[PDB]
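Reminder: ligand-aware prediction takes two inputs, not one.
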Amino acid sequence: QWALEDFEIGRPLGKGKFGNVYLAREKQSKFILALKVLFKAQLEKAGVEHQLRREVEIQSHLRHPNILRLYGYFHDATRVYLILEYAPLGTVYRELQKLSKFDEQRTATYITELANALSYCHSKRVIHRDIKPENLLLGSAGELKIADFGWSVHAPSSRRTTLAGTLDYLPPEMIEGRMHDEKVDLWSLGVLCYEFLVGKPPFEANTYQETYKRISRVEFTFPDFVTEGARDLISRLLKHNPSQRPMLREVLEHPWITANSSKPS
Ligand SMILES: Nc1ncnc2c1ncn2[C@@H]1O[C@H](COP(=O)(O)OP(=O)(O)O)[C@@H](O)[C@H]1O
Ligand SMILES: CCOC(=O)C[C@@H]1C(=O)NCCN1Cc1ccc(C)cc1
Ligand SMILES: [Cl-]
Ligand SMILES: [Cl-]
Ligand SMILES: [Cl-]
Ligand SMILES: [Mg+2]
Ligand SMILES: [Mg+2]
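Here is what comes back for the chain with chloride ion:
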């Protein structure tokens, strides 16, 4: 079906571990999209074919306004190409670098959009597991979109794959390699809410080793400017025991969320 010669390639949109992502236009229709390019050699050396397969399977069948579409894929002798919905306003990661911290209204609005998307996923027992600002994209109206489903799975689950870079968004049971479920994404939601308001993640440290210790002991503190309501929500999400973390419905109905968010459920 699709091949490289069907597209004109444009500027680089971003780079991940495996993904080299470019703007592109389909020649016959003039349809603008994002082409995520992957090198078969690297996919093989790291043995993550199964993650590539998860990404395509999951993200092509999901349909939600806060989840990035994957339209299809093709490959040649050396590369795999994923055909993605283009997100024109970039990453939440980039927006945070620009603004330093987000106000309560912006933050609550992003958390609602996240909770809506995750509620859709969890209803199929799909868990994302890699929710962080570089994987959160922005639509033409500034709406948040979850992307990069390569680490996703069906719960419950173990971990058969070596962890990559930062531990900053992972809960104790994932880093300790224990069994885990949907509640992992709730922990990550708590980390994100804190980082949006404060400008950095709550367990950040100088070394992998120290970050690990801070996560497993749940050692975090708040700057004076974080309000009582935000503190309440964040403290409920960052519980060591996953069974004690709230349901997404409880997040969406939290008074600090309903008081400050621009969007509904
Ligand atoms: N659809 C898209 N629209 C705009 N930018 C994108 C899109 N997809 C990815 N990017 C940019 O490319 C980066 C890497 O993409 P990602 O799919 O997260 O790669 P990896 O799987 O290697 O982490 C993202 O962090 C983002 O900056
Ligand atoms: C849906 C998962 O796969 C594809 O996206 C494309 C295509 C296919 O249809 N099945 C699997 C082999 N092939 C891709 C491939 C990827 C990586 C390496 C190292 C070799 C081959
Ligand atoms: Cl497993
Ligand atoms: Cl795994
Ligand atoms: Cl729920
Ligand atoms: Mg990524
Ligand atoms: Mg990936």
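The domain at 91-260 is CATH 1.10.510.10 (Transferase(Phosphotransferase); domain 1). The chain has ten helices and nine strands. We will return to this case in the review session.
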